[PDB]
């Protein structure tokens, strides 16, 4: 199998894609200092998220089926989300806004107070509402069972946060450091 190597390239400040994520992150995050953006470049994970993409784009027709959103993690699980992904109940959350990713609760602050959040690339694709409870996607078709949802959303109309299921699904494209 394909061992998911990585690189980490950190963004200077200066550099047109920093002011695109520093952009993202400060419409809900401006009070937050930014330490550092950081792009993971991991070619194995990006083939295969562009592979589940290419599949998607062709079955939900006129769909912007790439969403960015933010995903704020524990220090700690930053070198395991660089090779893996989020990938492995079988559900990985991500807020819309950056603010609801900066809260403590799931960027946690490391012993320095720095928290990180990536700024992923998720395959949202055909989503519907759905509650705390579910594990799984329901189902889009009751007489095709086997037909589900690529994720599931707070709010159909305004989404806040998403829920992705699938491998592939999710790429951590960005790594936002940040403290108080
Ligand atoms: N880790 C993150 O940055 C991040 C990003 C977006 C959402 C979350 N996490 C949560 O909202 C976790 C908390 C929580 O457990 N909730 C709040 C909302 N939940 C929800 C589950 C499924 C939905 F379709 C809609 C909402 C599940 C119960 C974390």
Known sequence: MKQQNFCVVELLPSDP???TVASKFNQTCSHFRIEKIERIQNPDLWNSYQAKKK???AK???????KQLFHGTDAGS???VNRNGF????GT???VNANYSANDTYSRPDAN???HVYYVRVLTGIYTHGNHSLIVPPSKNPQNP????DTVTDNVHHPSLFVAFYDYQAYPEYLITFRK
Request: hydrophobic content about 20%; charged content about 25%; glycine content about 10%.
């Open 17 to 19: 894609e920093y002011n």
């Open 113 to 115: 107070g720095r928290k």
């Open 60 to 66: 939900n027709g006129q769909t912007m089926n790439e």
């Open 87 to 90: 990938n492995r109940g079988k």
């Open 78 to 80: 930053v070198p395991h």
């Open 146 to 149: 086997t037909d589900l949802y």
């Open 55 to 57: 599949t998607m784009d």
């Open 93 to 95: 959350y991500f807020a």
